[PDB]
Design a protein around this ligand. Structure first.
Ligand SMILES: Nc1ncnc2c1ncn2[C@@H]1O[C@H](COP(=O)(O)OP(=O)(O)O)[C@@H](O)[C@H]1O
Ligand SMILES: Nc1ncnc2c1ncn2[C@@H]1O[C@H](COP(=O)(O)OP(=O)(O)O)[C@@H](O)[C@H]1O
Ligand SMILES: O=c1[nH]cnc2c1ncn2[C@@H]1O[C@H](COP(=O)(O)O)[C@@H](O)[C@H]1O
Ligand SMILES: CC[N+](CC)(CC)CC
Ligand SMILES: NCCC[C@H](N)C(=O)O
Ligand SMILES: NCCC[C@H](N)C(=O)O
Ligand SMILES: [Cl-]
Ligand SMILES: [Cl-]
Ligand SMILES: [Cl-]
Ligand SMILES: [K+]
Ligand SMILES: [K+]
Ligand SMILES: [K+]
Ligand SMILES: [K+]
Ligand SMILES: [K+]
Ligand SMILES: [K+]
Ligand SMILES: [K+]
Ligand SMILES: [Mn+2]
Ligand SMILES: [Mn+2]
Ligand SMILES: [Mn+2]
Lengths: 379, 1058
């Protein structure tokens, strides 16, 4: 019997079985309601330092594949599920779940009451936790580790996941027919956008590429100055893990961009930064939004979108500078989801327009960005 | 955005009587729609010929019409109610068809009736398969290679193109009605002919085969704001080729990657947008090639369905309620989600933290020569649903709640049967109702998962799980009961294993296993359904059992709880009538102040609607499952008498296990059920029972038969034997012997007894004589021929029995009236399937009433003391599934075969009869040529009938003997030859449409067997036919009435009672 254990900051224990690597995992514990999309979710940099619990019982039904990786690696700290299926059963599968987990050296546990954990996290809020997988997983140790966990509040995680050097991205989206495309030639892209890598998802890039943008991915700490030197058609602010607030450099640089007429667009962490750089404040959510069935209303059009969410922090609406107009709101909880600079070509979104995994409902958000771009070039 | 202001009154088109492919799901949906429209302050009008519907309850709507769902009748209703709009998406295909007929007839225009929910164009765009194919092509969605055919010529050309096998699908049909798979020309011709004549647009779509591909469904919802959500995804366990309704299906989808899922999601929304559904739900179907994920759209149903009902139950998202409101201008964003205390909007996509499993319920055993292989045309009669934290756990619970005698994966074949691997291969390759159990037997036999895959095309994802259960079973059998340590036992439980199944394997009684669990403190916890994987709290108590850590039951200590036990999946004989009763008990006792707990697992019903009770446990209605709930609920009383056989069978054990079973005692019931005990009681009371006997051996019976006298009723497949030879005859082919009462009138009496008094609920007179099962008999309330005197004796006999048996709640007594003398057929110390009918006719809600009585409130206390004898005639007629099983002889007998019923209301029995008959989809005409071919005994009576028809202006035909007797009477019918007599023979004439009516009576096994042809031909050709002289008489009577003349609301009717 391959034992495994999960212990929460508060002393709550969950006994199950090991399905990943051998060892220990510590991080903030969250729950995600997506019934499909597990690989994409584990591979999203925004999950770095977090222990991901999946509410949907059977995780691994379709195994895994490269095309379904949202990044260079598994950022999730640990994986907590209810049931690891006997087999992966999908034409796109290249390796079973457990094997991928092991290959990615991830500590994972299965066979536990994810529902009770979910309800606990819902009612009491996020909690730090530790998963120990091995012959004789120590419960006290686990609890120690969880208690010790410094916590995500005030933690800059962007500088930790960002790229080392800048680079180009010209690869577009995947299609059932031909899989992932061959990166385009630079002359195949009208537009040139600079994307700050705060722990950016591949789907965002690919989608931008689908829209005619050749990209220049830059490290999280790049100076506005260095950027501007590049004569960008548009500037993009990626999603990413941790607290946005502590990211002074980003805020600083953005503010700078906001002096200029350069179009700015942000998603999730990007959205928060943009709000910070604009005078708004950020808060830590009780438990956040992590799932793919989240209704968000476009207040302007009075239309609802089913969205993919992944955030533990949010922009406080009652601290929004008058130059900051509310564009979208959560239909689940009234929390802020979109904003637009009344005075500048800049806007952002709390959710993941690029989905992956999740509904395509929010993808049009990208088009406004392209609009801005096109117009800026006119000028 | 809010509610529409231009509309004040709405007409809701009901589904009509229950049929294979169109069942209870429509009472659930219709009741929902009413509730939601009434809630929103609209004036509610509905038509629905099925009286055993909650939707037809008076208090549920403003104007309730239990009338034939005939466009002419609907027109009167409209003319009389002037509804502003009509909601046609909640009554199955009947509602769709009707809506479009009225539209076509220009009735809608005529009375300025606005069609809401789905527009006639959207409905046709979806129902007309030609149009649907075009639409797909427009939006670039892929469909299989197909061809439209309006004639057999047209059709054969397509077959030549697409090749065999090919799928035949009629436009304007559902539940695979009129369709099938054709493996050869002969099959092809047959299905097409049937389909062409069945299609309301006389059209068929014939498609190349995609058999074996994965099959999926998605329940979508769209609003006027273009907001659109996927409420539930469904993956079929059985692949493409077996209708979804005859398939084991699970929610959610299991083997699709997110990428594929999104494609499918988008496609689904595209579908509704192109068809034009903007204010309601719709079911969209797909086929996926597992080898490359190739997506193909199959069809879409612009309304609520059996899947939407399943989805609703599965997710906790009440689709029909929401859809109803969407029909009147509301948008999803404005509606609240019920289960999340309304703290969240309806505009969202549900997320579930468990697996939902549905298994169809079949009844092939009731259909002699029916082909029993599954195909594209539905054959199931019901369904069970179950929920578990795991697929294994979900599937096994469903199996044990299926009401077939399974306790899980019980073996079908033996291990040491050399031939087994043969039977197994067969059962896999060509699926029947038993396949699930064969899959397990195959694994026990050494077949690999790949081996199984290759024969069934069922995803290995599911297969591997069944194999694992097997290996586990083997372990259990190996280690035995001593090997059943708490760890292992818990593993088992968590995998869904039933005590019963472990018991069998371990070779012990089921109670033994339960004891063990009791010793180990091994009990399930209850999780709640919430639509959101627990992301938001719930104030609703809709739960399922599982073997996990935290329990969410949180039973209340505050109230007096009452449990009501449902009947599980529906089957022939155990229909909606029972659920109806169940629902009532809950509503009643809830209203009265009790905390009502409902226990059931039929996803189609109103009883499994969270709104029906205080607490709902969607569980298998088994001793095990029921005892666990009782353990924690610690209720005050349990009602076992209203869900049919399922809960009745449990009564004894429950009580012994300590359950506070209320109303008529288990023992009392046994007194009545038990042949011996009963007979013995009947005696004690000195009443009439037919001469009977219990035989062991053949010759034993031949002699005993001699005693009792012929004809006999032989019960082991129960047959009527007329002579020694016949007796013997049956024996080979083959113990209770009962003297058959020929030419007798069968009566049904429903009533309530509080131990203090007896309330006569209703005395119904069967049109068909004793010998035709009561369940398949048309009946009249009040009696239409029986004398008062004779009726008074019954009343008297009822009362004596009531007291003697110690009835405490409902009972039903069956009588036979022969020669002014009354005989006792049987006693049913419980709620009968006639209860809803009687309640609807008399205005008294017997189920409510008897419920209170069982719960301690006397009839007196209630104020229900006098027997209602309505100022009108109410006639109940049935609907039979013969059309679904062409190989069967479409003839009535002592065994029940009907799936549904209808009610007919009239100022005269003839009126009521004509209404009941039309409502039953009869094809009877008021003119033409009638064919008469009756048995000997009917020879005398047939003259009058022949006379009546002549009077009616019909022309007659008759078989030899029949013509003899007629001529001897001055009636010279036209002679026709029996098939074997040569041309021109009945078969030809029938086929050539020479008759509009047929009266065919037969008696005797071979005699029936030999005349099979006429009845089958009658059915295939659409000629209304009676198989009883009584039925024939009633039909003739109805010739004098006009069912489209007068219409009446239940409310109105009810108000006419004094
Ligand atoms: N080309 C095809 N090959 C194989 N099976 C098919 C094909 N088209 C449809 N089916 C099967 O026929 C069943 C019934 O078809 P459907 O279009 O849904 O008609 P209905 O409206 O009567 O439900 C499907 O659920 C599926 O199993
Ligand atoms: N002795 C009998 N004489 C005439 N008809 C009978 C007799 N016994 C039963 N029947 C017929 O058979 C039907 C079924 O018999 P019953 O004992 O009520 O069986 P079940 O348990 O299915 O109700 C009755 O509704 C009736 O028409
Ligand atoms: O084509 C047929 N073959 C055999 N029996 C038939 C056929 N048509 C009618 N019958 C039966 O013939 C009987 C009437 O026979 P008659 O007495 O000659 O009129 C009924 O019991 C019918 O079911
Ligand atoms: C499926 C219900 N019918 C078609 C709509 C056939 C009995 C009613 C006529
Ligand atoms: N399960 C009984 C209590 C339910 C509670 N309101 C919750 O949602 O946690
Ligand atoms: N109530 C049964 C339906 C009657 C049918 N026409 C028959 O006589 O067989
Ligand atoms: Cl139909
Ligand atoms: Cl293909
Ligand atoms: Cl058949
Ligand atoms: K566990
Ligand atoms: K109108
Ligand atoms: K359709
Ligand atoms: K299927
Ligand atoms: K379907
Ligand atoms: K009868
Ligand atoms: K009975
Ligand atoms: Mn259909
Ligand atoms: Mn279908
Ligand atoms: Mn009976």
């Amino acid at each position: 019997i391959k034992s495994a254990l999960l212990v929460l900051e508060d002393g709550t224990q969950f006994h199950g079985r090991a399905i990943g690597a051998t060892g220990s995992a510590v991080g903030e514990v969250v729950f995600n309601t997506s019934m499909t999309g597990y690989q994409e979710i584990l591979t999203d940099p925004s999950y770095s330092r977090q222990i991901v619990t999946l509410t949907y019982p059977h995780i691994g039904n379709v195994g895994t594949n490269d095309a379904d990786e949202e990044s260079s690696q598994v950022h999730a700290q640990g994986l907590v599920i209810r049931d690891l299926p006997l087999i992966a059963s999908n034409f796109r599968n290249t390796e079973d779940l457990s094997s991928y987990l092991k290959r990615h050296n991830i500590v994972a546990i299965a066979d536990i009451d994810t529902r009770k954990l979910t309800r606990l996290l819902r009612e009491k809020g996020a909690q730090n936790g530790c998963i120990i997988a091995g012959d004789n997983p120590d419960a006290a140790l686990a609890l120690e580790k969880a208690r010790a966990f410094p916590g995500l509040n005030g933690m800059d995680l962007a500088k930790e996941v960002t790229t080392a050097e800048a680079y180009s991205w010209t690869q577009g989206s995947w299609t059932l027919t031909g899989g992932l495309p061959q990166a385009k030639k630079e002359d195949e892209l009208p537009f040139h956008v600079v994307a700050y890598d705060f722990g950016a998802k591949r789907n965002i890039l690919r989608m931008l590429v689908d829209r005619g943008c050749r990209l220049t991915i830059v490290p999280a700490q790049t100076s506005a100055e260095d950027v501007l030197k590049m004569n960008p058609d548009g500037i993009f602010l990626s999603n990413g893990p941790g607290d946005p607030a502590p990211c002074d450099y980003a805020i600083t640089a953005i503010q700078k961009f906001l002096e200029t007429d350069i179009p700015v667009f942000g998603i999730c962490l990007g959205h928060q930064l943009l709000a910070l750089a604009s005078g708004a404040k950020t808060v830590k959510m009780k438990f956040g939004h992590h799932g793919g069935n989240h209704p968000v209303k476009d207040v302007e059009k009075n239309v609802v979108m089913i969205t993919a969410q992944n955030h533990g922090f949010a922009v406080d609406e009652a601290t929004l500078p008058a130059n900051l107009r509310v564009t979208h709101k959560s239909l689940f909880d009234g929390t802020l989801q979109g904003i637009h600079r009344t005075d500048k070509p800049a806007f952002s979104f709390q959710g993941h327009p690029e989905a992956s995994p999740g509904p395509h409902d929010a993808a049009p958000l990208f088009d406004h960005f392209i609009e801005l771009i096109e117009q800026y070039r006119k000028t | 955005m809010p509610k529409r202001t231009d509309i004040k009154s709405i007409l809701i088109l009901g589904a009509g009587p229950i049929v294979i492919g169109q069942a209870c799901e429509f009472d659930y949906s219709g009741a929902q729609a009413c509730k939601a429209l009434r809630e929103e302050g609209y004036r509610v009008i509905n038509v629905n010929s099925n009286p055993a519907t909650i939707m037809t309850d008076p208090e549920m709507a403003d104007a309730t019409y239990i009338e034939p769902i005939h466009w002419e009748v609907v027109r009167k209703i409209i003319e009389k109610e002037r509804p502003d709009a009509v909601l046609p998406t909640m009554g199955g295909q009947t509602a769709l068809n009707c809506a479009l007929e009225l539209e076509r007839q220009g009735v809608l225009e005529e009375f300025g009736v606005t069609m809401i929910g789905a527009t006639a164009d959207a409905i046709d765009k979806a129902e007309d398969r030609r149009r649907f194919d075009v639409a797909m092509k427009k939006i670039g969605l892929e469909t299989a290679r197909s061809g439209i055919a309006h004639t057999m010529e047209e059709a054969l050309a397509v077959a030549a193109d697409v090749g065999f096998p090919c799928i035949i699908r009629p436009s304007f049909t559902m539940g695979g009605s009129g369709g099938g798979i054709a493996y050869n020309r002969e099959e092809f011709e047959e299905i097409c002919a049937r389909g062409l004549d069945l299609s309301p647009t006389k059209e068929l779509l014939i498609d190349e085969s995609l058999i074996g591909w994965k099959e999926y469904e998605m329940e979508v919802v769209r609003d006027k704001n273009d907001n659109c959500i996927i409420v539930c995804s469904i993956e079929n366990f059985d692949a493409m080729g077996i209708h979804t309704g005859d398939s084991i299906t699970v929610a959610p989808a299991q083997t699709l990657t997110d990428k594929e899922y999104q494609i499918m999601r988008n496609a689904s929304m595209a579908v509704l947008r192109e068809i034009g559904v903007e204010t309601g739900g719709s079911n969209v179907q797909f086929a996926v090639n597992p080898k490359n994920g190739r997506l193909i759209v199959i069809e879409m149903n612009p309304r609520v369905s059996r899947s939407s009902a399943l989805a609703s139950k599965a997710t906790g998202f009440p689709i029909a309620k929401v859809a109803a409101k969407l029909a009147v201008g509301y948008t999803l964003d404005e509606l609240m989600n019920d289960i999340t205390g309304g703290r969240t909007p309806a505009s969202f996509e549900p997320s579930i933290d468990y697996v939902v499993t549905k298994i169809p319920r079949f009844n092939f055993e009731k259909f002699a020569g029916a082909n029993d292989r599954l195909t594209t045309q539905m054959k199931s009669v019901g369904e069970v649903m179950a929920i578990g934290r795991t697929q294994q756990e979900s599937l096994q619970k469903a199996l044990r709640g299926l009401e077939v005698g399974a306790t899980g994966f019980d073996p079908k074949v033996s291990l040491d049967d050399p031939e087994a691997l043969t039977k197994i291969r067969r059962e896999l390759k060509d699926a029947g109702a038993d396949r699930i159990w064969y899959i397990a037997d195959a694994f026990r036999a050494g077949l690999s998962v790949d081996g199984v895959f290759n024969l069934t095309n069922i995803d290995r994802w599911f297969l591997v799980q069944i194999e694992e259960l097997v290996r586990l079973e083997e372990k259990v059998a190996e280690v035995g009961i001593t090997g059943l340590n708490a760890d292992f036992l818990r593993q088992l439980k968590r995998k869904g294993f039933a005590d019963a199944r472990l018991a069998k394997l371990a070779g012990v009684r089921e109670a033994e296993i339960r004891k063990l669990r009791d010793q180990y403190d091994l009990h399930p916890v209850y999780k709640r359904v919430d639509t959101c994987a627990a992301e938001f709290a719930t104030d609703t108590a809709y739960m399922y059992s599982t073997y996990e850590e935290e329990c969410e039951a949180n039973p209340s200590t505050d109230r007096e709880k009452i449990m009501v036990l449902g009947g599980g999946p529906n089957r022939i004989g155990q229909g909606i009538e029972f659920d109806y009763c169940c629902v009532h008990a809950s509503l009643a006792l809830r209203e009265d102040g009790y905390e009502t707990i409902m226990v059931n697992c039929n996803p189609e019903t109103v009883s499994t609607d969270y709104d029906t009770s205080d607490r709902l446990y969607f569980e298998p209605v088994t001793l095990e499952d029921v005892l666990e709930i009782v353990r924690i609920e610690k209720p005050k009383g349990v009602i076992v008498q209203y869900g049919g056989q399922t809960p009745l069978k449990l009564a004894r054990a429950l009580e012994a296990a300590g359950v506070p079973v209320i109303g008529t005692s288990p023992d009392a019931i046994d007194r009545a059920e038990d042949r011996e005990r009963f007979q013995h009681a009947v005696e004690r009371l000195k009443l009439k029972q037919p001469a009977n006997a219990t035989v062991t051996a053949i010759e034993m019976a031949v002699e005993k038969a001699k005693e009792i006298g012929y004809p006999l009723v032989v019960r082991p497949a129960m047959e009527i034997v007329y002579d020694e030879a016949d007796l013997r005859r049956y024996f080979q082919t083959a113990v209770l012997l009962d003297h058959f009462l020929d030419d007798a009138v069968e009566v049904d009496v429903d009533a309530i007894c509080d131990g203090e008094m007896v309330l006569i609920g209703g005395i119904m007179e069967h049109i068909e004589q004793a010998g035709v099962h009561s369940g398949d008999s048309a009946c009249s309330l009040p009696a239409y021929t029986l004398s008062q005197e004779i009726q008074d004796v019954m009343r008297q006999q009822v009362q004596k029995l009531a007291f003697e048996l110690q009835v405490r709640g409902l009972m039903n007594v069956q009588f036979a009236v022969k020669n002014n003398e009354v005989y006792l057929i049987e006693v049913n110390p419980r709620a009968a399937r006639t209860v809803p009918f009687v309640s609807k006719a008399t205005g008294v809600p017997l189920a409510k009433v008897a419920a209170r009585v069982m719960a301690g409130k006397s009839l007196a206390e209630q104020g229900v003391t006098k027997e209602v004898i309505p100022p009108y005639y109410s006639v109940k007629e049935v609907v039979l599934p013969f059309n679904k099983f062409p190989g069967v002889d479409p003839l009535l007998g002592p065994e029940m075969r009907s799936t549904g019923e209808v009610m007919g209301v009239g100022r005269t029995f003839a009126e009521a009869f004509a209404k009941a008959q039309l409502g039953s989809n009869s094809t009877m005409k008021k003119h033409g040529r009638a064919l008469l071919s009756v048995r000997e005994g009917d020879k005398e009576r047939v003259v009058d009938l022949a006379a009546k028809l002549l009077k009616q202006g019909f022309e007659l035909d008759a078989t030899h003997g029949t013509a003899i007797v007629l001529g001897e009477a001055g009636i010279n019918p036209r002679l026709v030859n029996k098939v074997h007599e040569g041309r021109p023979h009945i078969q030809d004439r029938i086929k050539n449409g020479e008759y509009t009516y047929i009266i065919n009576t037969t008696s005797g096994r071979r005699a029936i067997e030999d005349s099979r042809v006429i009845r089958r031909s009658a059915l295939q050709y659409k000629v209304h036919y009676d198989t009883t002289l009584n039925g024939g008489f009633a039909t003739a009577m109805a010739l004098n009435a006009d069912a489209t003349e007068k219409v009446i609301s239940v409310q109105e009717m009810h108000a006419q009672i004094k």
